[PDB]
Paper text:
[name] complexes lacking the Arp8 module (ΔArp8) were purified from yeast strains lacking the Arp8 subunit, which results in the absence of the entire module. To test this possibility structurally, we determined the cryo-EM structure of ΔArp8 [name] bound to S.c 0/40 nucleosomes in the presence of ADP/BeFx. The overall architecture of the C-module of ΔArp8 [name] bound to 0/40 nucleosomes is again similar to that observed with WT [name] bound to S.c 0/40 and 0/80. However, the density corresponding to the HSA around the [name] motor domain that was observed with the Arp8 module in WT [name] is no longer detectable. This is likely because, without the Arp8 module, the HSA region is either poorly structured or highly dynamic. We interpret the absence of HSA density as indicative of an activated state, where the HSA is no longer held in an inactive conformation by the Arp8 module. In contrast, this deletion resulted in a ~75-fold increase in remodeling of S.c 0/40 nucleosomes. Thus, the Arp8 module plays an auto-inhibitory role on 0/40 nucleosomes.
Residue numbers in the entry:
A (entry chain D), G (entry chain H): 36 to 128
B (entry chain C): 16 to 121
C (entry chain F): 25 to 103
D (entry chain E), F (entry chain A): 38 to 134
E (entry chain B): 23 to 103
H (entry chain G): 13 to 120
Write the structure that this text describes.
DNA sequence: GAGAATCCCGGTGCCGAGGCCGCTCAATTGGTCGTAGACAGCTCTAGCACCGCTTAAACGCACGTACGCGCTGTCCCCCGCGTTTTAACCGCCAAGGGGATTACTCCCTAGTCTCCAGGCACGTGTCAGATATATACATCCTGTGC
DNA sequence: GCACAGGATGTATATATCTGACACGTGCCTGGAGACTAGGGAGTAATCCCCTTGGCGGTTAAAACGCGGGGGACAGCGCGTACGTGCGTTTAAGCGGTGCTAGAGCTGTCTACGACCAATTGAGCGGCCTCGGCACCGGGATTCTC
């Protein structure tokens, strides 16, 4: 029993494209892609949390990390939508 | 009720929070951090599948092949710059020809 | 004869995939030497993973981690 | 009694190769080479099937990336032919030592 | 605006080239190399200032800059302690 | 009087600079450069002096490595004189854009 | 209160070259070198132990980390001196 | 009952307790074995000893006494194993390598 | 002007990518508490700004010389193609050998209190450049005559 | 036009002074070591089943080979030109000095956010099933090309 993001990336696609199909090896491309990006951003977050002698993981250091590892117009767009998501999560407490 | 619903997102804040919990990064992890992480992965996945779907619609194909993934990831210079050290399984090369590699004149 | 397994039309195929018009004839053996030093690195990088995992067969995931360690990471084979 | 120009059929097979994306090394001799270099380290190493494909896609990817840069090196020298000094030029400028 | 990119003077690019072991330097290379200096400069200092603004400091210390060199694989010694 | 052949004193100052250790740029134009190129990201941003020295030795190491690589690129091209296309070729082969 | 490796590396060069001074900029080079080598080998051993699904860092995966990271001839010298160090440690009789 | 540390019990001069302390709250794993700090102490001792042998030999070739970072740069970069180990590093106040390509000389 | 070589369209299965039910862990909910981070306060380090004089260094102009570069005939060694052979490719049997998976048990290592000495931070005694006299002695510059 | 004598001058080498940059003896404090406890993680072992390597054999695109030719590397050679050399003329870092002053950092104190434990339910993973998107085979229009 192993875990992946099959139904979730498929629901994202069927939200944006109700007609395009996905090969399973293409989906393995996307899975290795998404957890690769996850591992980079989480490792940078771990470093920059330890760098400022902080023992806790929070939103501000992954914020700084996603500005610094994502460059232009995928930095500011991701920051904007993620701030929207965390505000709509905190408002819906 | 699922916390992905109360954040309005379709990637698993519980599962990525659990993976971050044994992710072995610090002794404590905040609540909004997997929410923000889920949001940035959701936006980035949405953009890469948007480019892949547009590349699929350009070449009359309704199934995603990794050739179409390579055409989607390498045409955009930003994603080319972020994926500069990464190669794609069964990807291929963008057709690029230097101007004097074409023979003759006019 | 086992050493020369990568044949001359295969270097031709890789070169025209690279998009090169004219090929000098002294390329091919040194390109073979380039292969036998490049994949040398990842065989060393993967069999150590295999023996530390108490296994004597390799798989996709550990050599993908070897490629990730040496900077030319690959997708689609797990990882 | 027709003979084609050097540069017609060659350029058209570069185009036909660039539209295609299939593997170019024959898989069985490459399988022989990776086994015969692996047995120098640990005898009786079994091999998973897609690991050979992963190694193959890595080595076509790296040789294509090397050949494009060496073509750039050769065309920078006002030449249409690559050469082994252009190979070592690309390897030094890649920083591959 | 000011003599700030061109404040790195014309014999200085020459001296840096002679540190590498060149002989002949063309005259039109100086503004291009100044462009090279500046284009390396913003994408090291943007990492430096993101590390700075996370610390809630509005002075840039010597530690976050050398970890910003550590970011892209251009790690540096001496100011790490 | 008696002069020297051109290039004979060039190698003399080559070995003088490569024998040397100290830094070959004045600190103040660098400092104004980083102040006027860093103010766009954030205003009134003060600086540690040894951070400026770190920026110094990092960028001078990048420039001497790039100039050495560009010298190799130029000498591969049957020349000693270094041109714009040598810089473009070198920046294409180290990978950065 | 500050942390370094100054006295230890100091007696390292005194035990083989006693008529040799050391500079504090050079000593900062040395401290940054040993810290960088430590963090590289420790994070790669940690990532390698995460491959195994092993939650414990033992000596076997860090000597594996030596063989991955350190170049081969000094790697085998390093593992030789490491084995005599841990066997001299294990001889608590 | 009075006993000394485990550094000399391992016969080593780097602090095994300090590097163990950095192994706990470096959060690389939640569980650390006993042989890991003594082994890491040993390998850091070996690399540091090799570095100071090369630095001392460079300083005696320059017949100095105090290790200038020029000595460290020539100790690292004139040995090939350290060149692959420390390829992407820059050493402060280190300078560059004395090398002349053979075409640049006046061959006449 | 011909002709292989491309794109484009019609007929063949087919086999690998979407639906569909079971349900098992694993996301989600509620209560506790201790601690690490958030805000206030105070100090001192050191970062910025400017005065003023220095001078090594840079800018600018004239020259001139080795090298960058355009052309030109020369191989001559790379490229297009028939022909064979030959080793790669595919279908499929097998078997056994190695990863996977559960379970139990030890032992090995996290967590806590005590302490004391290891390793600092911070003073002083101890060797290398620089200035200076001094005085005879060898060596060089300079005035002079045959 | 050349040899001889008088004056100047480095200079060598021994002390004295005299400053400037180093290794070594005490407070101190805090973190490493030792003893105890506890619990869960890895080690081992036994079985299961999956897959992986040979092993045929047919067959088939593909490589080795050589032959004719032709475009491209290449040494040379002229020609100009573009950067190295040099020196007058600013000049602007630089040092150091001072004056100020704001922010880094350390402590204190609170409190609020989340680790942790007991309980819950749901939803995604996976075997099974369906079927239609598309590679493939054959025929026709069309494109650079000599």
């Amino acid at each position: 029993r192993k875990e992946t993001y099959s139904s979730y990336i498929y629901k994202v696609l069927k939200q944006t494209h109700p007609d395009t199909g996905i090969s399973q090896k293409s989906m393995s491309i996307l899975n290795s892609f998404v957890n690769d990006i996850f591992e980079r951003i989480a490792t940078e977050a771990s470093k920059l949390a330890a760098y400022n002698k902080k023992s806790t993981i929070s939103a501000r250091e992954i914020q700084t990390a996603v500005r610094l590892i994502l460059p232009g117009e995928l930095a500011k767009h991701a920051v904007s939508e993620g701030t929207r998501a965390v505000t709509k999560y905190s408002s819906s407490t | 009720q699922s916390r992905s619903a109360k954040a309005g997102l379709t990637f698993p804040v519980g599962r990525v929070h659990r993976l971050l919990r044994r992710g072995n990064y610090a002794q404590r992890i905040g609540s909004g951090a997997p929410v923000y992480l889920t949001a940035v992965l959701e936006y980035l996945a949405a953009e890469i599948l948007e480019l892949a779907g547009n590349a699929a619609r350009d070449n009359k194909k309704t199934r995603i092949i990794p050739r179409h993934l390579q055409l989607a990831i390498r045409n955009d210079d930003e994603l080319n710059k972020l994926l500069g050290n990464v190669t794609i399984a069964q990807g291929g090369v963008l057709p690029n020809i230097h101007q004097n590699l074409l023979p003759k004149k006019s | 004869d086992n050493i020369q397994g990568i044949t001359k039309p295969a270097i031709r195929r890789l070169a025209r995939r690279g998009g090169v018009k004219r090929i000098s004839g002294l390329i091919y053996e040194e390109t073979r030497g380039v292969l036998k030093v490049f994949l040398e690195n990842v065989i060393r990088d993967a069999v150590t993973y295999t023996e530390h995992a108490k296994r004597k067969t390799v798989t996709a995931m550990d050599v993908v981690y070897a490629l990730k360690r040496q900077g030319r990471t690959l997708y689609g084979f797990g990882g | 009694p027709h003979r084609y120009k050097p540069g017609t059929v060659a350029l058209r097979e570069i185009r036909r190769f660039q539209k295609s994306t299939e593997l170019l090394i024959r898989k069985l001799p490459f399988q022989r080479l990776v086994r015969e270099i692996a047995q120098d380290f640990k005898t009786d190493l079994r091999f998973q099937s897609s690991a050979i494909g992963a190694l193959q896609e890595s080595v076509e990817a790296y040789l294509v990336s090397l050949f494009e840069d060496t073509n750039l090196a050769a065309i920078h020298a006002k030449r249409v032919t690559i050469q082994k000094k252009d190979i070592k030029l690309a390897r030094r400028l890649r920083g591959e030592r």
